[PDB]
Curated annotation (Swiss-Prot), chain A:
Task of the protein: May play a role in sequestering potentially toxic fatty acids and their peroxidation products, or it may be involved in the maintenance of the impermeable lipid layer of the eggshell.
Keywords: Lipid-binding, Secreted, Signal, Transport
Keyword Cell division appears in the UniProt entry: no
Subcellular location as annotated: Secreted
InterPro entries, per the entry: Calycin, Fatty_acid-bd, Lbp1-4
An example Gene Ontology CC term for this record: extracellular region
CDD domains: FABP
Record remark: domains: Forms a beta-barrel structure that accommodates hydrophobic ligands in its interior.
GO molecular function term, any single one: lipid binding
Main location: secreted
Reported tissue expression: Expressed in presumptive hypodermal cells by the comma stage and in posterior body wall muscle cells by the two-fold stage. From L1 to adult stages, expression continues in body wall muscle cells adjacent to the pseudocoelom, while hypodermal expression is extinguished.
Protein name, entry field: Fatty acid-binding protein homolog 3
Keyword Coiled coil attached: no
Amino acid sequence: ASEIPEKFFGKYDLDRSENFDEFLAAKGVSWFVRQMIKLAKVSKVLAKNETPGKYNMENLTSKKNTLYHGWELGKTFEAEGLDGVAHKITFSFKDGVLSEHHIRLNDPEHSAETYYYTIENDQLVMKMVNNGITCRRWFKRS
Amino acid sequence: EIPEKFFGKYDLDRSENFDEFLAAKGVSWFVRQMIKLAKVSKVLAKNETPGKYNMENLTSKKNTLYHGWELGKTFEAEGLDGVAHKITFSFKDGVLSEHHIRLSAETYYYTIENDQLVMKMVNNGITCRRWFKRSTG
Protein backbone atom coordinates (compact mmCIF):
# COMPACT_ATOMS: atom_id res chain seq x y z
CA ALA A 1 0.00 0.00 0.00
CA SER A 2 0.94 3.67 0.42
CA GLU A 3 1.11 6.09 3.33
CA ILE A 4 -1.06 8.60 1.45
CA PRO A 5 -4.50 7.00 0.89
CA GLU A 6 -5.42 5.94 -2.62
CA LYS A 7 -8.29 8.46 -2.82
CA PHE A 8 -5.80 11.35 -2.81
CA PHE A 9 -4.21 10.42 -6.13
CA GLY A 10 -5.41 11.75 -9.46
CA LYS A 11 -5.94 14.90 -11.51
CA TYR A 12 -8.26 17.62 -10.22
CA ASP A 13 -9.67 20.77 -11.83
CA LEU A 14 -10.31 24.00 -9.91
CA ASP A 15 -14.06 24.25 -9.32
CA ARG A 16 -14.82 27.00 -6.78
CA SER A 17 -13.34 29.06 -3.94
CA GLU A 18 -14.41 30.75 -0.70
CA ASN A 19 -12.80 33.91 0.72
CA PHE A 20 -10.08 33.88 -1.96
CA ASP A 21 -10.44 37.49 -3.15
CA GLU A 22 -10.27 38.55 0.50
CA PHE A 23 -7.21 36.33 0.91
CA LEU A 24 -5.52 38.08 -2.02
CA ALA A 25 -6.52 41.56 -0.81
CA ALA A 26 -4.83 40.95 2.55
CA LYS A 27 -1.68 40.10 0.57
CA GLY A 28 -1.62 43.55 -1.05
CA VAL A 29 -2.81 42.37 -4.48
CA SER A 30 -4.53 45.10 -6.47
CA TRP A 31 -8.08 44.78 -7.76
CA PHE A 32 -6.92 44.46 -11.38
CA VAL A 33 -4.62 41.55 -10.55
CA ARG A 34 -7.18 39.92 -8.24
CA GLN A 35 -9.57 39.87 -11.20
CA MET A 36 -7.14 37.99 -13.46
CA ILE A 37 -6.07 35.53 -10.75
CA LYS A 38 -9.66 34.55 -9.90
CA LEU A 39 -10.26 33.83 -13.60
CA ALA A 40 -7.19 31.62 -14.13
CA LYS A 41 -7.91 27.91 -14.51
CA VAL A 42 -5.60 25.51 -12.65
CA SER A 43 -5.38 21.74 -12.33
CA LYS A 44 -3.52 19.77 -9.67
CA VAL A 45 -2.01 16.29 -9.97
CA LEU A 46 -0.95 13.99 -7.14
CA ALA A 47 0.79 10.79 -8.18
CA LYS A 48 3.17 8.17 -6.86
CA ASN A 49 6.77 8.43 -8.03
CA GLU A 50 8.25 5.60 -10.09
CA THR A 51 10.24 4.56 -7.01
CA PRO A 52 8.30 3.45 -3.91
CA GLY A 53 8.18 5.87 -1.00
CA LYS A 54 8.20 9.05 -3.10
CA TYR A 55 5.44 11.13 -4.65
CA ASN A 56 4.90 13.78 -7.33
CA MET A 57 2.72 16.88 -7.21
CA GLU A 58 2.03 18.99 -10.30
CA ASN A 59 0.37 22.40 -10.80
CA LEU A 60 -0.99 22.90 -14.36
CA THR A 61 -2.05 26.21 -15.92
CA SER A 62 -2.38 27.52 -19.47
CA LYS A 63 1.23 28.75 -19.67
CA LYS A 64 3.17 27.53 -16.59
CA ASN A 65 3.44 24.02 -15.14
CA THR A 66 5.26 23.38 -11.86
CA LEU A 67 6.24 19.83 -10.90
CA TYR A 68 7.58 18.69 -7.51
CA HIS A 69 8.88 15.15 -8.01
CA GLY A 70 10.62 12.50 -5.94
CA TRP A 71 9.80 13.97 -2.53
CA GLU A 72 9.16 12.06 0.70
CA LEU A 73 6.89 12.87 3.62
CA GLY A 74 8.55 14.74 6.47
CA LYS A 75 11.76 15.20 4.45
CA THR A 76 12.50 18.85 3.69
CA PHE A 77 14.18 19.53 0.35
CA GLU A 78 15.57 22.57 -1.43
CA ALA A 79 14.90 23.97 -4.90
CA GLU A 80 16.44 26.94 -6.69
CA GLY A 81 14.58 29.38 -8.93
CA LEU A 82 15.58 31.22 -12.07
CA ASP A 83 17.48 34.05 -10.35
CA GLY A 84 19.17 31.55 -8.01
CA VAL A 85 16.93 32.19 -4.96
CA ALA A 86 16.27 29.04 -2.94
CA HIS A 87 13.18 27.65 -1.21
CA LYS A 88 12.80 24.89 1.38
CA ILE A 89 9.71 22.73 0.80
CA THR A 90 8.26 20.03 3.06
CA PHE A 91 5.33 17.67 2.51
CA SER A 92 3.70 16.00 5.52
CA PHE A 93 0.69 13.73 6.02
CA LYS A 94 -1.24 13.07 9.23
CA ASP A 95 -4.91 12.50 10.06
CA GLY A 96 -6.15 12.79 6.49
CA VAL A 97 -4.35 16.11 5.85
CA LEU A 98 -1.50 16.48 3.38
CA SER A 99 0.45 19.65 4.16
CA GLU A 100 2.77 21.55 1.81
CA HIS A 101 5.14 23.97 3.54
CA HIS A 102 7.19 26.50 1.57
CA ILE A 103 9.72 29.02 2.88
CA ARG A 104 12.00 31.46 1.07
CA LEU A 105 15.54 31.50 2.55
CA ASN A 106 16.51 34.94 1.11
CA ASP A 107 13.20 36.43 2.40
CA PRO A 108 12.48 36.54 6.25
CA GLU A 109 10.23 33.87 7.87
CA HIS A 110 7.17 35.96 6.75
CA SER A 111 7.30 33.84 3.53
CA ALA A 112 6.03 30.83 5.58
CA GLU A 113 3.30 29.42 3.32
CA THR A 114 1.38 26.26 4.15
CA TYR A 115 -1.21 24.53 1.95
CA TYR A 116 -3.54 21.92 3.47
CA TYR A 117 -5.06 19.27 1.19
CA THR A 118 -7.98 17.02 2.16
CA ILE A 119 -10.27 14.72 0.20
CA GLU A 120 -13.86 15.76 0.94
CA ASN A 121 -16.85 14.27 -0.90
CA ASP A 122 -14.42 12.94 -3.55
CA GLN A 123 -13.07 16.47 -4.20
CA LEU A 124 -9.61 17.85 -3.46
CA VAL A 125 -9.95 20.70 -0.96
CA MET A 126 -7.11 23.18 -0.42
CA LYS A 127 -7.00 25.36 2.69
CA MET A 128 -4.73 28.41 2.95
CA VAL A 129 -4.18 30.66 5.97
CA ASN A 130 -2.24 33.93 5.75
CA ASN A 131 -2.57 37.37 7.37
CA GLY A 132 -5.33 35.93 9.54
CA ILE A 133 -7.46 35.08 6.47
CA THR A 134 -8.64 31.51 5.83
CA CYS A 135 -9.72 30.59 2.31
CA ARG A 136 -10.68 27.33 0.62
CA ARG A 137 -10.49 26.20 -3.00
CA TRP A 138 -12.28 23.10 -4.31
CA PHE A 139 -10.91 20.95 -7.14
CA LYS A 140 -13.16 18.41 -8.84
CA ARG A 141 -11.74 15.08 -9.96
CA SER A 142 -11.04 14.73 -13.67
CA GLU B 1 12.41 33.05 -35.54
CA ILE B 2 14.43 31.31 -32.81
CA PRO B 3 17.48 29.74 -34.51
CA GLU B 4 17.89 25.98 -34.58
CA LYS B 5 21.07 25.90 -32.47
CA PHE B 6 19.22 27.27 -29.43
CA PHE B 7 17.11 24.14 -28.92
CA GLY B 8 18.23 21.28 -26.69
CA LYS B 9 18.91 20.34 -23.07
CA TYR B 10 21.77 21.96 -21.14
CA ASP B 11 23.34 21.25 -17.74
CA LEU B 12 24.82 23.96 -15.52
CA ASP B 13 28.62 23.95 -15.82
CA ARG B 14 30.10 27.14 -14.34
CA SER B 15 29.29 30.71 -13.31
CA GLU B 16 31.04 34.06 -12.95
CA ASN B 17 30.24 36.74 -10.33
CA PHE B 18 27.30 34.66 -9.08
CA ASP B 19 28.36 35.11 -5.44
CA GLU B 20 28.32 38.92 -5.46
CA PHE B 21 25.12 38.81 -7.51
CA LEU B 22 23.34 36.91 -4.74
CA ALA B 23 25.00 39.05 -2.05
CA ALA B 24 23.62 42.15 -3.78
CA LYS B 25 20.15 40.55 -3.59
CA GLY B 26 20.40 40.11 0.19
CA VAL B 27 21.09 36.36 0.25
CA SER B 28 22.98 35.34 3.38
CA TRP B 29 26.44 33.79 3.27
CA PHE B 30 25.24 30.34 4.34
CA VAL B 31 22.39 30.27 1.82
CA ARG B 32 24.83 31.41 -0.88
CA GLN B 33 27.05 28.36 -0.34
CA MET B 34 24.34 25.81 -1.14
CA ILE B 35 22.88 27.83 -4.04
CA LYS B 36 26.09 27.52 -6.07
CA LEU B 37 26.12 23.82 -5.15
CA ALA B 38 22.71 23.26 -6.77
CA LYS B 39 22.59 21.45 -10.09
CA VAL B 40 20.35 23.13 -12.67
CA SER B 41 19.33 22.15 -16.19
CA LYS B 42 17.45 24.09 -18.87
CA VAL B 43 15.42 22.84 -21.84
CA LEU B 44 14.50 24.93 -24.88
CA ALA B 45 12.09 23.32 -27.33
CA LYS B 46 9.63 24.11 -30.08
CA ASN B 47 5.98 23.65 -29.18
CA GLU B 48 3.87 21.20 -31.17
CA THR B 49 2.14 24.29 -32.58
CA PRO B 50 4.67 26.11 -34.80
CA GLY B 51 5.43 29.66 -33.77
CA LYS B 52 5.26 28.69 -30.10
CA TYR B 53 8.00 27.51 -27.77
CA ASN B 54 8.58 25.77 -24.45
CA MET B 55 11.25 26.46 -21.86
CA GLU B 56 11.88 24.25 -18.84
CA ASN B 57 13.99 24.73 -15.71
CA LEU B 58 14.96 21.44 -14.07
CA THR B 59 16.33 21.01 -10.55
CA SER B 60 16.69 18.01 -8.25
CA LYS B 61 13.06 17.93 -7.11
CA LYS B 62 11.34 20.86 -8.87
CA ASN B 63 10.73 21.47 -12.58
CA THR B 64 9.10 24.60 -14.02
CA LEU B 65 7.74 24.59 -17.59
CA TYR B 66 6.67 27.66 -19.55
CA HIS B 67 4.84 26.18 -22.54
CA GLY B 68 3.15 27.54 -25.65
CA TRP B 69 4.58 31.07 -25.53
CA GLU B 70 5.28 33.35 -28.48
CA LEU B 71 8.05 35.85 -29.12
CA GLY B 72 6.99 39.39 -28.23
CA LYS B 73 3.76 38.30 -26.54
CA THR B 74 3.51 38.91 -22.79
CA PHE B 75 1.75 36.23 -20.74
CA GLU B 76 0.56 35.99 -17.17
CA ALA B 77 1.48 33.14 -14.81
CA GLU B 78 -0.35 32.33 -11.55
CA GLY B 79 1.24 30.37 -8.65
CA LEU B 80 -0.39 28.80 -5.55
CA ASP B 81 0.77 31.78 -3.39
CA GLY B 82 -0.87 34.22 -5.86
CA VAL B 83 2.11 36.31 -7.10
CA ALA B 84 1.11 37.24 -10.71
CA HIS B 85 4.13 36.66 -13.02
CA LYS B 86 4.23 38.89 -16.16
CA ILE B 87 6.77 36.88 -18.26
CA THR B 88 7.77 37.96 -21.81
CA PHE B 89 10.10 36.20 -24.30
CA SER B 90 11.79 38.14 -27.14
CA PHE B 91 14.56 37.46 -29.65
CA LYS B 92 16.86 39.89 -31.46
CA ASP B 93 20.51 40.01 -32.58
CA GLY B 94 21.24 36.46 -31.44
CA VAL B 95 19.94 37.11 -27.90
CA LEU B 96 16.88 35.50 -26.32
CA SER B 97 15.49 37.78 -23.59
CA GLU B 98 13.20 36.49 -20.80
CA HIS B 99 11.56 39.43 -18.96
CA HIS B 100 9.74 38.74 -15.67
CA ILE B 101 7.58 41.19 -13.65
CA ARG B 102 5.71 40.49 -10.38
CA LEU B 103 2.42 42.49 -10.43
CA SER B 104 10.70 43.31 -9.63
CA ALA B 105 12.02 43.47 -13.17
CA GLU B 106 14.29 40.50 -13.88
CA THR B 107 15.66 39.93 -17.38
CA TYR B 108 17.63 36.85 -18.45
CA TYR B 109 19.69 37.02 -21.65
CA TYR B 110 20.53 33.73 -23.38
CA THR B 111 23.09 33.21 -26.13
CA ILE B 112 24.75 30.20 -27.76
CA GLU B 113 28.52 30.56 -27.37
CA ASN B 114 30.90 27.73 -28.32
CA ASP B 115 27.89 25.38 -28.41
CA GLN B 116 27.01 26.20 -24.79
CA LEU B 117 23.97 28.01 -23.44
CA VAL B 118 25.04 31.26 -21.76
CA MET B 119 22.75 33.12 -19.36
CA LYS B 120 23.48 36.74 -18.42
CA MET B 121 21.81 38.56 -15.53
CA VAL B 122 22.14 42.21 -14.49
CA ASN B 123 20.73 43.26 -11.12
CA ASN B 124 21.75 45.86 -8.52
CA GLY B 125 24.71 46.80 -10.72
CA ILE B 126 26.24 43.30 -10.79
CA THR B 127 26.51 41.40 -14.08
CA CYS B 128 26.68 37.62 -13.72
CA ARG B 129 27.04 34.89 -16.33
CA ARG B 130 26.22 31.19 -16.19
CA TRP B 131 27.28 28.51 -18.66
CA PHE B 132 25.22 25.43 -19.50
CA LYS B 133 26.87 22.63 -21.46
CA ARG B 134 24.78 20.65 -23.93
CA SER B 135 23.53 17.49 -22.21
CA THR B 136 25.35 14.36 -23.34
CA GLY B 137 23.57 11.19 -24.41
